[PDB]
């Protein structure tokens, strides 16, 4: 289950990301969406860095942190 | 920022147009199929009565 | 501009409504033609049956 | 390495260059515009491209948020269940092998949304099916954990019985049933 | 579309919550009122401002209704057509003139 439900949750997250990128970002659908496994201590910095590099509940396009 | 507001308005208009076009295409296809099926059924019933 | 965006949204909504109405009208016309098309085939088959009866 | 930390996912539009400092978009974006961590970032499109209406899109977004919360809760419950065995809890909770790989290896792509989840049928339908399947699997895992807990409670209750010499007897491993008190002339003798 | 009025100070938060509640965007328009309105809920002559928005789906319109009601923003059934809006305004004025006359008469009788 820690694999099957894991895959189910990943697919659900992909669906949510598609829904957000089809709502926040506008049609026609397109996305440079990419998931970065951040260094353990860099998560706060990346949010600070990304929100800095964001042409804007997270603002701009979806930046929902995973796990 | 004017470009962003115009982009948002264009995105809303494009979403509306895409939804309308998809609905119209689905309606047209379903209507054509249903019309063909109903014509075939009516012709078959009339032909059975005539036979 | 906000007013330009609102006007564009209104125009897009009007165009969408017109497209939906045109699709519905085309659907009705196609259904009517199919009903007429079935009537033509039924009439042709009845004419064939009448010709067969006359030949008999 | 950072092969077990929290993974950050963004959905920046493919049109513009989100780099605040000029730089360049896409790969140059992930390499410079996010160079503060300068960490690995990649994904491949797996679009549930079937898009309904704007109201439908928003309702499906809310439902997707709810399903994501539910799936996260299920994953946490599975982590707790593994802590029941405690071997995966002794190590990193992410170390459990998924799709013949660890978590970062599997997350290196996301193309699994091809056949099993759906077949590009409908966004609302795909969300409903994924949520229902995940809920059923989570319910099965919860039932298995409940059964294991009940069995452990039964074992604890069985072991709680003191082996004789007290209000709890040792009839399992005492000489009571096999004693000469087993049968009497017109009764059966039992006393301790 | 969306028609209603709300306190001019809270229009910014109303706009923020509109932009956030639907993850995308929606058309918006606003205009400050000339004089404060003594709202029954507010029980004071607080400032107000007109609120106008637009959306496609009917569920989005219902959500706008719900959040506007939660934000204590009353709504009115305006007419998109210029002729219909003019007719509605004329009917409103026709009723309202009798309303001013009757309120003046009853106030005079009560004070007397």
Q: What is the CATH number of the domain that holds D122?
A: 1.20.1460.10
- D23 alpha-carbon distance from chain centroid: 40
Residue E91 has which token pair?
Answer: 């009917």
Q: CB pairs below 8 Å between B and D: how many?
A: 7
Residue range of the domain that includes D142: 46-167
Quick check: E28 contacting C, CB < 8 Å?
Answer: yes
d(CA D30, CA D32): 6
The neighbour count for residue D65, using CB atoms within 10 Å, is 16
> Which value, to the nearest 10 degrees, does the dihedral of the CA atoms of residues A37, A41, A42, A43 take?
70
Chain E interface, Cβ < 8 Å to A: 20, 22-25
Strand partners, A35: D9, D42
Q: CA distances (Å), E34 to each of C3, D171, E8, E68, in order?
A: 21, 94, 11, 22
- E 26-85 residues with CB below 8 A of B? 26-27, 56
d(CA D77, CA D87): 15
Closest by Cα among D53, E21, D17 to B17 = D53
Q: In degrees rounded to 5, what are phi and psi of residue E9?
A: -75, -25
Our CA-based measurement puts residue E33 at a distance from the nearest CA of chain B, in whole angstroms, of 25
Sheet strands (E) in chain C = none
Closest by Cα among B8, C10, C5, A27 to E56 = C10
Quick check: B9 contacting D, CB < 8 Å?
Answer: no
> Which value, to the nearest 10 degrees, does the dihedral of the CA atoms of residues E78, E81, E83, E84 take?
-40
Experimental method: cryo-EM
* Nearest residue of B to residue D15, measured between CA atoms: B7
Total length of chain D: 192
Quick check: B9 contacting E, CB < 8 Å?
Answer: yes
Q: CB pairs below 8 Å between A and E: how many?
A: 10
* Nearest residue of B to residue E54, measured between CA atoms: B12
Closest by Cα among D61, D146, D75, B44 to A24 = D61
Q: Does an interface of 3+ CB pairs under 8 Å exist between B and E? A: yes
The torsion region of residue D34 among left (phi > 0), alpha (psi -120 to 50) and beta comes to: alpha
Strand partners, A65: D8
Resolution of this model in Å is 3.8
Quick check: D73 contacting A, CB < 8 Å?
Answer: no
d(CA D112, CA A11): 7
Which residues, other chains included, contact D18 with Cβ-Cβ below 8 Å and sequence gap of 6+? A53, A54, A55, A60, A61, D12, D25, D29, D33
d(CA C24, CA E110): 62
For D61-108, the DSSP string reads HHHHHHHHHHHHHHHHHHHHHHHHH-HHHHS-GGGS--SSS-HHHHHT
Our CA-based measurement puts residue C55 at a distance from the nearest CA of chain B, in whole angstroms, of 16
* Nearest residue of E to residue A57, measured between CA atoms: E20
- D142 alpha-carbon distance from chain centroid: 10
Residues in C closer than 8 angstroms to B23, CB to CB, are 20, 23
Chains that touch D (3 or more CB pairs under 8 A): A, B, E
* Nearest residue of E to residue C16, measured between CA atoms: E56
Residue numbers after which chain E breaks, C to N beyond 2.5 angstroms: none
d(CA D65, CA A63): 14
The neighbour count for residue E75, using CB atoms within 10 Å, is 15
Residue A66 DSSP label: E
Q: For an interface test with E, which of B8, B10, B14, B19 has the most E Cβ atoms less than 10 Å from its Cβ?
A: B8
Quick check: D3 contacting A, CB < 8 Å?
Answer: yes
Q: Does an interface of 3+ CB pairs under 8 Å exist between D and E? A: yes
d(CA D110, CA D87): 28
- A 6-65 residues with CB below 8 A of D? 6-25, 27, 29-40, 42-43, 45-50, 52-55, 60-65
Our CA-based measurement puts residue D54 at a distance from the nearest CA of chain B, in whole angstroms, of 7
Any long-range contacts for C1-8 (C-beta under 8 Å, 24+ apart)? Answer: C1/B2, C1/B5, C2/B5, C2/E27, C2/E28, C2/E29, C3/E29, C4/B6, C4/B9, C5/B5, C5/B6, C5/B8, C5/B9, C5/E27, C6/B9, C6/E27, C6/E29, C6/E54, C8/B9, C8/B10, C8/B13
D84, burial (CB in 10 Å: exposed 0-12, middle 13-18, buried 19+): middle
Quick check: C47 contacting B, CB < 8 Å?
Answer: no
Q: For an interface test with A, which of E23, E55, E56 has the most A Cβ atoms less than 10 Å from its Cβ?
A: E23
For D140-186, the DSSP string reads HHHHHHHHHHHHHHHHHHHHHS--SSSSS--TTSSSSTTSTTS--SS
Quick check: E24 contacting B, CB < 8 Å?
Answer: yes
Total length of chain A: 67
Helix (H) or strand (E) holding C48: helix C2-55
Closest by Cα among A31, E23, E20 to D48 = A31
Residue B29 has which token pair?
Answer: 């296809």
Q: Does an interface of 3+ CB pairs under 8 Å exist between E and A? A: yes
Cβ–Cβ below 8 Å for C42 and B43: yes
Q: Maximum distance among all alpha carbons in chain D?
A: 104
């Amino acid at each position: 289950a820690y694999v099957d439900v894991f895959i189910n949750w990943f697919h659900i997250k992909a669906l949510r990301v598609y829904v957000e990128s089809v709502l926040r970002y506008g049609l026609p659908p397109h996305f440079n969406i990419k998931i970065i496994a951040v260094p353990p201590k860099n998560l706060s910095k990346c949010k600070s860095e990304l929100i800095d590099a964001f042409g804007f509940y997270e603002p701009f396009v979806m930046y929902i942190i995973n796990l | 920022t004017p470009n962003q507001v115009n982009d948002e308005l264009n995105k809303m208009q494009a979403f509306i147009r895409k939804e309308a076009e998809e609905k119209a295409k689905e309606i047209q296809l379903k209507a054509d199929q249903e019309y063909e099926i109903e014509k075939t059924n009516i012709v078959r019933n009339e032909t059975n009565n005539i036979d | 501009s906000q007013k330009n965006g609102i006007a564009t949204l209104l125009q897009a909504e009007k165009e969408a409504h017109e497209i939906v109405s045109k699709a519905r009208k085309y659907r009705q016309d196609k259904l009517k033609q199919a009903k007429t098309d079935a009537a033509k085939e039924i009439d042709s088959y009845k004419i064939q049956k009448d010709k067969e009866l006359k030949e008999f | 390495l950072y092969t077990a930390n929290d993974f950050i996912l963004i959905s920046l539009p493919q049109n513009a260059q989100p780099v605040t400092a000029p730089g360049s978009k896409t790969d140059s974006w992930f390499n410079e515009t996010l160079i503060g961590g300068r960490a690995f970032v990649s994904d491949f499109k797996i679009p549930e491209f079937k898009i309904g209406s704007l109201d439908t899109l928003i309702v499906e977004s809310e439902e997707l948020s709810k399903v994501d919360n539910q799936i996260g809760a299920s994953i946490g419950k599975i982590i707790e269940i593994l802590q029941g065995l405690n071997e995966t809890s002794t190590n990193a909770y992410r170390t459990l092998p998924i799709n013949n790989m660890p978590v970062p290896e599997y997350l290196e792509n996301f193309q699994w949304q091809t056949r099993k989840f759906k077949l590009d049928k409908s966004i609302k339908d795909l969300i409903t099916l994924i949520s229902n399947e995940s809920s059923q699997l989570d319910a099965d895992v919860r039932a298995t954990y409940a059964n294991y807990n009940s069995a452990k409670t039964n074992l604890a209750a069985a072991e709680r019985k003191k082996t004789g010499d007290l209000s709890v007897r040792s009839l399992h491993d005492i000489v009571k049933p096999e004693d000469f008190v087993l049968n009497s002339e017109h009764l059966t003798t039992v006393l301790v | 579309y969306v028609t209603g009025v709300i306190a001019r100070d809270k229009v910014a938060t109303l706009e923020q919550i509109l932009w956030r509640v639907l993850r995308g965007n929606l058309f918006f328009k606003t205009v400050e009122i000339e004089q404060p309105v003594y709202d029954v809920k507010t029980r004071e002559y607080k400032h107000k401002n007109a609120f106008i928005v637009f959306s496609h789906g009917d569920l989005i319109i219902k959500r706008i209704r719900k959040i506007a009601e939660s934000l204590d923003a009353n709504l009115y059934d305006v007419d998109s057509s210029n002729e219909g809006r003019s007719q509605q305004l004329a009917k409103v004025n026709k009723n309202l003139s009798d309303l001013y006359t009757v309120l003046k008469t009853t106030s005079t009788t009560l004070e007397s």
